[PDB]
Short mmCIF file of C-alpha atoms in Angstrom, two decimals:
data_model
loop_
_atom_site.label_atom_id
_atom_site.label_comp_id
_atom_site.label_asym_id
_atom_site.label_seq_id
_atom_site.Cartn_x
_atom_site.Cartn_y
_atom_site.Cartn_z
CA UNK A 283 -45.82 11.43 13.82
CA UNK A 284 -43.37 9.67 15.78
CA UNK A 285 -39.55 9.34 15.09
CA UNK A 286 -40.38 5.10 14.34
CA UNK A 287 -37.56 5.29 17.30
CA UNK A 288 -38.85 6.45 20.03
CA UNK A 289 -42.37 4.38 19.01
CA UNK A 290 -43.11 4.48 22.80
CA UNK A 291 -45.66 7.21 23.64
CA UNK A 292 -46.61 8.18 27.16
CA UNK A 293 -49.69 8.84 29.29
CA UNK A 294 -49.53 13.08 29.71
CA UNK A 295 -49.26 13.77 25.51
CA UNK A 296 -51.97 11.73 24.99
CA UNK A 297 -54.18 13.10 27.55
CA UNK A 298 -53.42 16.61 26.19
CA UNK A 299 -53.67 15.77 22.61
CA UNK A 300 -57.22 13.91 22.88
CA UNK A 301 -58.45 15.86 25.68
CA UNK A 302 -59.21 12.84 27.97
CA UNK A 303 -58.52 11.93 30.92
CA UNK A 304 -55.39 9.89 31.89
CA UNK A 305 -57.53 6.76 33.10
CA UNK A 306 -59.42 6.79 29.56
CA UNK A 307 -56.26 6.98 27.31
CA UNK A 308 -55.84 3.07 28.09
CA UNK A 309 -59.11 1.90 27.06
CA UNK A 310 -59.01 4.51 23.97
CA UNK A 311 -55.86 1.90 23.10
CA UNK A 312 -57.26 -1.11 24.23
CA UNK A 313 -59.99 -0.26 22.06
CA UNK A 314 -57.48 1.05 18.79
CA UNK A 315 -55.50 -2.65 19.47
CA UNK A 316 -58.92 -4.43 19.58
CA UNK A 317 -60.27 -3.28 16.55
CA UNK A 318 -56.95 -4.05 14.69
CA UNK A 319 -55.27 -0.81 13.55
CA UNK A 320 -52.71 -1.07 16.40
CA UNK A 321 -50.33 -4.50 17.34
CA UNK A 322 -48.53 -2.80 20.39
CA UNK A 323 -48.75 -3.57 23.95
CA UNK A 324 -49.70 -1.23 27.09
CA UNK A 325 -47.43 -1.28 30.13
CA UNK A 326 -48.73 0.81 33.19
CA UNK A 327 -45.93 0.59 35.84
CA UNK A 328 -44.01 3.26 33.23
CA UNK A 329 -47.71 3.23 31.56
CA UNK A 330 -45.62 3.66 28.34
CA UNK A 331 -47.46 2.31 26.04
CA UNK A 332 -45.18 -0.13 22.95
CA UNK A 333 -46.03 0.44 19.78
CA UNK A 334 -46.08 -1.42 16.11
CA UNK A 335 -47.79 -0.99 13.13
CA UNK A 336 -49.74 -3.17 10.82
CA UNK A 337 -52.56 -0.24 9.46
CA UNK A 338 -51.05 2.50 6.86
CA UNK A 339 -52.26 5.57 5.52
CA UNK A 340 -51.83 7.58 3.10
CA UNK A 341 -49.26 9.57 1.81
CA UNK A 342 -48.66 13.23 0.16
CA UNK A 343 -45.97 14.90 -1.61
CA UNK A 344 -43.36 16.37 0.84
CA UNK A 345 -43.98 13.26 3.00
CA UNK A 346 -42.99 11.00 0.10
CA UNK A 347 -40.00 13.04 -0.41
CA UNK A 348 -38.83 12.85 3.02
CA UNK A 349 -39.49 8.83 2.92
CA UNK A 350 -37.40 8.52 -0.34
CA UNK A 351 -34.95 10.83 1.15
CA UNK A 352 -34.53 8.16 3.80
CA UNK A 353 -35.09 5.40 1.44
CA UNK A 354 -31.39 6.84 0.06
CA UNK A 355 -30.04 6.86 3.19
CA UNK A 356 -31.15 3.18 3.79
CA UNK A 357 -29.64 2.24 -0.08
CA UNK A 358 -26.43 3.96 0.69
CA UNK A 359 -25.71 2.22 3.73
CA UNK A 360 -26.73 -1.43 2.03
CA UNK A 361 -23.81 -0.42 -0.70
CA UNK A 362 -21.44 0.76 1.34
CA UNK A 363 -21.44 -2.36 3.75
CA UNK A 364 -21.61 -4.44 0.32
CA UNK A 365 -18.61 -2.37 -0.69
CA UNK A 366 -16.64 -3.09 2.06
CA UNK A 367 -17.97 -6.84 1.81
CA UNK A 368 -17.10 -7.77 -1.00
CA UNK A 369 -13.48 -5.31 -0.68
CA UNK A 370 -12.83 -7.28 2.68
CA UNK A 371 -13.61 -10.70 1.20
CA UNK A 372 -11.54 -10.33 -2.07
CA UNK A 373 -9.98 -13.50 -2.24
CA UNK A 374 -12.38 -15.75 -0.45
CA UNK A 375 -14.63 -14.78 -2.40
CA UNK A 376 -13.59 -16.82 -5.85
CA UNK B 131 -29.85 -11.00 -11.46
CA UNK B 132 -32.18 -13.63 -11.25
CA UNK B 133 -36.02 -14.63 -12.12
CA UNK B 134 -35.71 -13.74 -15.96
CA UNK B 135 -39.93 -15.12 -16.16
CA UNK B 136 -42.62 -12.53 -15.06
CA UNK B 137 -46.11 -13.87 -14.66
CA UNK B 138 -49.31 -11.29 -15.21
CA UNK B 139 -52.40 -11.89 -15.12
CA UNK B 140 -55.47 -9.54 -16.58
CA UNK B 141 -57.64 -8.75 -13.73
CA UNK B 142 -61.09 -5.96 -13.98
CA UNK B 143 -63.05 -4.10 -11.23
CA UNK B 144 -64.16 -1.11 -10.30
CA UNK B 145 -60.61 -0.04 -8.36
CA UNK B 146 -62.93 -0.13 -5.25
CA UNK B 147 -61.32 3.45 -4.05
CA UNK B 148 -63.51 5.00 -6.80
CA UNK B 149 -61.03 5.24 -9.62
CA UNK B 150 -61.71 5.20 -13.74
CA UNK B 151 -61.21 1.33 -14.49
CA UNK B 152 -58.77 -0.04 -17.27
CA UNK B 153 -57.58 -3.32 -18.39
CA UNK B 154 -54.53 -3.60 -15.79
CA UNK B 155 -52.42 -6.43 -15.62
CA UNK B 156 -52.13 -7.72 -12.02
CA UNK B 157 -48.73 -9.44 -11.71
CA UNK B 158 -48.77 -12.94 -10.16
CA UNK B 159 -45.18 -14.75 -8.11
CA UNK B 160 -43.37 -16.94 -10.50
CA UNK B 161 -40.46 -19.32 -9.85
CA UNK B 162 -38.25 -21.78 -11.88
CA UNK B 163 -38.94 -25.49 -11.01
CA UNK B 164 -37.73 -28.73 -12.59
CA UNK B 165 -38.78 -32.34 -13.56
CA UNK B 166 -36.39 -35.09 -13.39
CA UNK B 167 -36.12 -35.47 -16.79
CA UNK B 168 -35.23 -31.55 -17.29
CA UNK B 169 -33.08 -31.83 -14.54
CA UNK B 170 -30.71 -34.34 -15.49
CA UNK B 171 -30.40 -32.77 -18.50
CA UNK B 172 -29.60 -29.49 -17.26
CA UNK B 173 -27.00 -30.63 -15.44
CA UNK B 174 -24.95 -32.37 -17.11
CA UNK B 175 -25.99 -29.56 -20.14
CA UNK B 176 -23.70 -27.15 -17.56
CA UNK B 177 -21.18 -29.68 -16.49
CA UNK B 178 -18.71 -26.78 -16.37
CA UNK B 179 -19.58 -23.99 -14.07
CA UNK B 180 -22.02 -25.91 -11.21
CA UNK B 181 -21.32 -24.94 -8.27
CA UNK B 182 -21.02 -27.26 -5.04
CA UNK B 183 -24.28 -28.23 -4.04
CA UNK B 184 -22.83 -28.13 -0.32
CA UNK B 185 -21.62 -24.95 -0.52
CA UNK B 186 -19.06 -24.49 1.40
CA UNK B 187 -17.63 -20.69 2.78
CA UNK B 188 -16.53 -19.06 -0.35
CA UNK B 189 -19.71 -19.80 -1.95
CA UNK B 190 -21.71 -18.85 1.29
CA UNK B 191 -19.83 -15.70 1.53
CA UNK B 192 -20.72 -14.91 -2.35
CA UNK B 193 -24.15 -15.85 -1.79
CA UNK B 194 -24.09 -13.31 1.20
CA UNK B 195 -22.80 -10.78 -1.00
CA UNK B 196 -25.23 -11.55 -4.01
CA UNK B 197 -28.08 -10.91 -1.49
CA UNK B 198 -26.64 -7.88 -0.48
CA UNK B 199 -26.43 -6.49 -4.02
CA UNK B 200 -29.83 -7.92 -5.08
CA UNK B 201 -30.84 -5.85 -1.68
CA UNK B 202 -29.00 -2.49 -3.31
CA UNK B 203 -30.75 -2.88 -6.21
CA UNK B 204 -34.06 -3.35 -5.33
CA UNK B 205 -33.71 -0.28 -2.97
CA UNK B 206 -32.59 1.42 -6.07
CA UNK B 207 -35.74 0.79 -8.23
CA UNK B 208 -37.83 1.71 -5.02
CA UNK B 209 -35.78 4.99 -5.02
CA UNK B 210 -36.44 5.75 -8.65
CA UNK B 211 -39.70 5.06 -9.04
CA UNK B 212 -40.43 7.08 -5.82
CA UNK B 213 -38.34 9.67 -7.08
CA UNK B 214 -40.46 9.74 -10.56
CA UNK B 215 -43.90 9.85 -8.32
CA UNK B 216 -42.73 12.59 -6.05
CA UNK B 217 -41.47 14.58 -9.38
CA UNK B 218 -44.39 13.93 -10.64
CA UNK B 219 -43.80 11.55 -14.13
CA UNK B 220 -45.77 9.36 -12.12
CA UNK B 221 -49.14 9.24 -10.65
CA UNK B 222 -49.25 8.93 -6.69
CA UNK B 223 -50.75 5.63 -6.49
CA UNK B 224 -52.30 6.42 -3.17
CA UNK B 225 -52.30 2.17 -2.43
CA UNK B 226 -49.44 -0.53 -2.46
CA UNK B 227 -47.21 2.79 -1.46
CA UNK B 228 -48.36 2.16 1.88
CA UNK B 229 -47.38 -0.93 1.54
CA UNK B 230 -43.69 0.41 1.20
CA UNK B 231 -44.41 2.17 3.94
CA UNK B 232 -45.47 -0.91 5.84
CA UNK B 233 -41.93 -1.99 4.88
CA UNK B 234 -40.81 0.98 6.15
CA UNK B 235 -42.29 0.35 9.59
CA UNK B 236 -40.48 -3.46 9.79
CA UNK B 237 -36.84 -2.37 10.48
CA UNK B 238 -36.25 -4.12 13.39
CA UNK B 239 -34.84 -1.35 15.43
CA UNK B 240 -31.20 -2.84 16.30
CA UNK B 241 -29.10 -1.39 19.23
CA UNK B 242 -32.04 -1.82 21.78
CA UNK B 243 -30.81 -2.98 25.07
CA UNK B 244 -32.15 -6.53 25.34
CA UNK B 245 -31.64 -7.30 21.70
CA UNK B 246 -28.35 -5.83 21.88
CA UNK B 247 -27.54 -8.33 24.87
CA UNK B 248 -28.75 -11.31 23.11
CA UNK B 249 -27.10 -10.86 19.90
CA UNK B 250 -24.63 -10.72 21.81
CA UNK B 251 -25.02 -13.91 23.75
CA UNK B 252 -25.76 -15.69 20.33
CA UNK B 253 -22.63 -14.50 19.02
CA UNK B 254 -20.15 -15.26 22.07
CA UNK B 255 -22.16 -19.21 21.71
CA UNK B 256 -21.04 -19.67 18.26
CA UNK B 257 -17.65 -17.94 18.98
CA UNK B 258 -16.37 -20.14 21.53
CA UNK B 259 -17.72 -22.95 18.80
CA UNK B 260 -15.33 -21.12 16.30
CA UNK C 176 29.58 9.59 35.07
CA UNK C 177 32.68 9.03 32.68
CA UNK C 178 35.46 10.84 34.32
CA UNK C 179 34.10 9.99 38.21
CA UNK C 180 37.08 7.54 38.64
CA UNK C 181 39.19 10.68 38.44
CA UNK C 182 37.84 13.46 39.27
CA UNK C 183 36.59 14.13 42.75
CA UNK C 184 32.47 15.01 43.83
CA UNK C 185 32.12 18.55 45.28
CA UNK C 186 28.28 18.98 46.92
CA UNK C 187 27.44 21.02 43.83
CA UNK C 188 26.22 18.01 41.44
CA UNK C 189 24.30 16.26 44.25
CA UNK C 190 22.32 19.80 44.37
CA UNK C 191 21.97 19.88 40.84
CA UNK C 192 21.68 16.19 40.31
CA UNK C 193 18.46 16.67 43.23
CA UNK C 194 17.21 19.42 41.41
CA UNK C 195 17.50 17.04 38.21
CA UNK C 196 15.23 14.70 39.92
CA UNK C 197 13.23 17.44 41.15
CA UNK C 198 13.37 19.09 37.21
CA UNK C 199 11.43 15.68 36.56
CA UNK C 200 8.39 16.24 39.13
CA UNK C 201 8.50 20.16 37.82
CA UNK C 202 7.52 17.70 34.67
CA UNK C 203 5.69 15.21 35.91
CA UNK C 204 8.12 13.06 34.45
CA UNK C 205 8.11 10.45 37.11
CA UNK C 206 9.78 7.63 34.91
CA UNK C 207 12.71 9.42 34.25
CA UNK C 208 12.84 10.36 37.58
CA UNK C 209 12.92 6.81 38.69
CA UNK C 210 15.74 5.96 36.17
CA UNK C 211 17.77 8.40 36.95
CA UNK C 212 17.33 7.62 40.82
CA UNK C 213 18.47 4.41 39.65
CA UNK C 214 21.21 6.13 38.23
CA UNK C 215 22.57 7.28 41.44
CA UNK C 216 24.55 4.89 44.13
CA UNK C 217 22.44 3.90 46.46
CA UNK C 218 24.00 4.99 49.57
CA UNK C 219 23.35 8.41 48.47
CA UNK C 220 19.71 7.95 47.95
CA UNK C 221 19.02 8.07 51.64
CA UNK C 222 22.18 9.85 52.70
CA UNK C 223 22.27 13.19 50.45
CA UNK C 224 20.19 15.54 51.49
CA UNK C 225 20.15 17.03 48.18
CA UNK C 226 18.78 13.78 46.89
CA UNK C 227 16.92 12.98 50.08
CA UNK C 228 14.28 15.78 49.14
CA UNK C 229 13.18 14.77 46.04
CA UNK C 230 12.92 11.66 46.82
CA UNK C 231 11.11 11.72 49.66
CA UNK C 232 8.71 14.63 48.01
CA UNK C 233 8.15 11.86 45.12
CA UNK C 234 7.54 9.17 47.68
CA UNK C 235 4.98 11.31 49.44
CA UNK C 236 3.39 12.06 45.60
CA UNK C 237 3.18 8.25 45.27
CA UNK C 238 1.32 7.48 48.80
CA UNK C 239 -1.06 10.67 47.47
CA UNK C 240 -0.01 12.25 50.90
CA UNK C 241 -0.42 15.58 48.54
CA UNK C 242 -0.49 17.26 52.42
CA UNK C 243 2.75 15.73 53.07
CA UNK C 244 4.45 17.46 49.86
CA UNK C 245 2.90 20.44 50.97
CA UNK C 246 4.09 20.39 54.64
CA UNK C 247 7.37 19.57 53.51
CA UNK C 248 7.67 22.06 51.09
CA UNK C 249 9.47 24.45 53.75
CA UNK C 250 12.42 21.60 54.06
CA UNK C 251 14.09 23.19 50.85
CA UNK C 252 17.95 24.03 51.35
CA UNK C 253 17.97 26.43 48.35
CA UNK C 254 15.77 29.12 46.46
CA UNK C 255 17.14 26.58 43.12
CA UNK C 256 14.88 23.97 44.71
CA UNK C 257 12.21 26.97 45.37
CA UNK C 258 11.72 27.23 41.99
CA UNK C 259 11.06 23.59 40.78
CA UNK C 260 9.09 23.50 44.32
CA UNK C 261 6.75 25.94 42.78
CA UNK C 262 6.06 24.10 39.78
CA UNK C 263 5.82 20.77 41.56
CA UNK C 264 2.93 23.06 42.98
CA UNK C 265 1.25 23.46 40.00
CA UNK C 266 1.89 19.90 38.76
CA UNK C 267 0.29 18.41 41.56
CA UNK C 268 -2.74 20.84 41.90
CA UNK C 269 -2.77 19.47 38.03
CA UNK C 270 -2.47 15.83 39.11
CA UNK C 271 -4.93 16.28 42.03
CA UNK C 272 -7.69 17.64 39.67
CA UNK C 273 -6.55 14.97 37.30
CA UNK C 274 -7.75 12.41 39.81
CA UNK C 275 -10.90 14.35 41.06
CA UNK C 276 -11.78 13.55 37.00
CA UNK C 277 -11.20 10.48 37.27
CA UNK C 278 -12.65 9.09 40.63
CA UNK C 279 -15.04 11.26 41.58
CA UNK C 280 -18.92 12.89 39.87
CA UNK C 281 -19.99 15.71 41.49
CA UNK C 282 -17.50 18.28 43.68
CA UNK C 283 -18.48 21.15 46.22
CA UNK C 284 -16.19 24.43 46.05
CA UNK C 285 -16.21 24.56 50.13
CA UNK C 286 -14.54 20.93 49.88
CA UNK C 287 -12.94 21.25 47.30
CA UNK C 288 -11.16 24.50 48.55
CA UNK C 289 -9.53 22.20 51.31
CA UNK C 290 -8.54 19.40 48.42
CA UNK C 291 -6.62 21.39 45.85
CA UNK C 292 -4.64 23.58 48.82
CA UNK C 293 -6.36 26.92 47.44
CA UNK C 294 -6.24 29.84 49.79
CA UNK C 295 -8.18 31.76 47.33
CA UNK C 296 -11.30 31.44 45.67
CA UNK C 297 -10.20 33.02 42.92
CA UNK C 298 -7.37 30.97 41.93
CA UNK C 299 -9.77 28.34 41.15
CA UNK C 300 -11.56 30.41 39.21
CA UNK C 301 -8.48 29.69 37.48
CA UNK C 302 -9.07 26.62 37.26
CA UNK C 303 -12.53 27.01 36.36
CA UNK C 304 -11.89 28.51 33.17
CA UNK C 305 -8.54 27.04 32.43
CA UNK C 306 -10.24 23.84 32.96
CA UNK C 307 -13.47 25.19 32.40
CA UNK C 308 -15.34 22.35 34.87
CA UNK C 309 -19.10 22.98 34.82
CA UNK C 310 -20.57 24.34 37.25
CA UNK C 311 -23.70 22.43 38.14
CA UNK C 312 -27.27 24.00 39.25
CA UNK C 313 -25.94 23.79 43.08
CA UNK C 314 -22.66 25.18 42.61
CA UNK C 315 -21.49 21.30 42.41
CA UNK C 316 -18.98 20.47 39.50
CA UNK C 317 -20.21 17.57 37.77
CA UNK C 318 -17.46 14.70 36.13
CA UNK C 319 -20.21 12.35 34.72
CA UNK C 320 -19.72 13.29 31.24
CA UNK C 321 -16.16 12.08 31.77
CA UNK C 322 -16.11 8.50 32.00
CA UNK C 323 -19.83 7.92 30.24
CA UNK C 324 -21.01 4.04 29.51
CA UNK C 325 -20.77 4.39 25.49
CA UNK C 326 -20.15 1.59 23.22
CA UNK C 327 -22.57 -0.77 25.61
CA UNK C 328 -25.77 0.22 23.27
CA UNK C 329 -24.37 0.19 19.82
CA UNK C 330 -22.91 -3.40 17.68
CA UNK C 331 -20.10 -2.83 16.50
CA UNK C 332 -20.77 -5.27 13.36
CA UNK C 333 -18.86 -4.01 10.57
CA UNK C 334 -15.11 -4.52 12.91
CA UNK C 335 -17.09 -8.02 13.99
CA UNK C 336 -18.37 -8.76 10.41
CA UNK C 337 -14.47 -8.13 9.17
CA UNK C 338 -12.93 -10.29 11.77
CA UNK C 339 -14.93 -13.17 10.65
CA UNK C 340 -14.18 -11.99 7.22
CA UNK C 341 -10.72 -12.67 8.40
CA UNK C 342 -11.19 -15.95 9.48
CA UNK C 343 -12.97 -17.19 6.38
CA UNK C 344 -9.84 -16.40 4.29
CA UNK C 345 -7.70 -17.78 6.48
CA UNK C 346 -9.73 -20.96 6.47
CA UNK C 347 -10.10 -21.00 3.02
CA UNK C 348 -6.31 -19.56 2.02
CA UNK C 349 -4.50 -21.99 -0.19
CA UNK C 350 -1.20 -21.85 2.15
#
């Protein structure tokens, strides 16, 4: 559920999500990573645990057309910076 | 575009995630390779329109731009064919989709701080190059 | 200045040519006030008092001796200066917050009361709506969504990507 922005998730909202205690949300992790569903990293001066992803799911209807919604947002940036490319580099471009 | 040769191969099991089995054709990666012979006679069959083998900037810049409409247009099939699943025309295939969504998860994120400051590093080392 | 090698210089235009100068800082407009100082023979800079003032009120504006102005305010010859002394009053309250902006983050009323020459809480609730600075949780006006660090987290790639654009075609450019 995060933003894929702000992939970092900290210590409180996960011990009042799972209902565990702050000094068990690290080894929940450590567990997650070691399995391998998870290819983050834990930090514990912030204890902000960094986040990637290598294990999908699966998907339903309004979240595919929010995905393809952003899909066209990621399309219409590639043309317009090929757009202005290939405007730009006119006569280099031969 | 490019690669005018598709490969497929007939593959048959049980879908594994409990699905009603078919015939299927699984597609397999092809590419366009030469032998000597062919490639001589290629060529000098073109001998017209070859471009520099060294490539030089216009033809780097082109190829920069042919990537970024091949790009486009891939994104564009994606689109439509997750536009025709999400209407509905097309079954949800519930598999590979993640997949997309796996290249979904890969952007690299630009504008954080320490890859910000190294790009721009890199590019002040080849500017003062320039 | 075209008929001066004939006709004679009664007091009058120094007044008015001080309150020209003084017009200016009415207007902030300190660069015309310097080239029309320049203007003026320079004996009379220092000697005129009707010149004197102005200059000597823009010289203390300069130096940010804001009290100075202030103090000397009462060294007016003429209600004609009053006027533009007024609005020199207003300018420089103006230029004075103008600089609190600028240098400054956070700013205490009490203080601040003693900075901008208020004797009334009131008129800077003037300035607090004209201005409209924020008021922060401690009754401290905060400035640090003035000068910000933007454009430090974002590439600007597209202006980069179409200088180098640039210098491919003029690398490549026949001429």
């Amino acid at each position: 559920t995060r933003p894929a922005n702000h992939r970092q998730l900290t210590f409180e909202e996960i011990a009042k999500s799972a209902k565990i205690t702050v000094n068990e949300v690290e080894l929940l992790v450590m567990k997650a990573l070691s399995v391998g569903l998870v290819k983050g990293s834990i930090d514990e001066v912030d204890k902000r645990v960094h986040m990637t992803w290598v294990q999908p799911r699966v998907l339903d209807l309004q979240q595919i057309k929010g995905m393809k919604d952003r899909l066209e947002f990621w399309c219409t940036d590639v043309k317009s910076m090929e757009m202005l490319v290939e405007h730009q580099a006119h006569d280099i471009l031969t | 575009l490019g690669l005018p040769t598709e490969a497929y191969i007939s593959v048959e099991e049980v879908h594994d995630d409990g699905t009603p089995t078919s015939k299927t054709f699984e597609h397999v990666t092809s590419e366009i390779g030469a032998e000597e012979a062919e490639e001589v006679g290629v060529e000098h069959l073109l001998r017209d329109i070859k471009d520099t083998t060294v490539g030089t900037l216009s033809q780097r810049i082109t190829n920069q731009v042919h990537g970024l409409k091949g790009l486009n247009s891939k994104l564009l099939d994606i689109r439509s064919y997750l536009e025709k699943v999400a209407t509905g025309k097309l079954p949800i295939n519930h598999q590979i989709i993640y997949q997309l969504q796996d290249v979904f998860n890969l952007l690299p994120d630009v504008s954080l701080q320490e890859f910000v400051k190294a790009f721009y590093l890199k590019t002040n080392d080849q500017m003062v190059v320039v | 200045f075209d008929y001066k090698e004939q006709l004679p210089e009664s007091a009058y235009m120094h007044q008015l040519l001080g309150l020209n100068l003084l017009f200016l800082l009415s207007q902030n407009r300190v660069a015309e006030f310097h080239t029309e100082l320049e203007r003026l023979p320079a004996k009379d800079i220092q000697t005129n008092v009707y010149i004197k003032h102005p200059v000597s009120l823009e010289q203390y504006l300069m130096e940010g001796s804001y009290n100075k102005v202030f103090l000397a305010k009462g060294n007016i010859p003429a209600e004609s200066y009053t006027f533009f002394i007024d609005i020199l009053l207003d300018t420089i309250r103006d230029e004075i917050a103008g600089c609190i902006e600028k240098a400054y983050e956070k700013i205490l009323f009490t203080e601040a009361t003693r900075i901008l020459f208020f004797n009334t809480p009131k008129k800077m609730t003037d300035y607090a709506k004209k201005r409209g600075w924020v008021l922060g949780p401690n009754n401290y006006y905060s400035f640090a969504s003035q000068q910000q660090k933007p454009e430090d987290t974002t590439i600007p790639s597209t202006e980069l990507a179409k200088q180098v654009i640039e210098y491919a075609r003029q690398l490549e450019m026949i001429v």
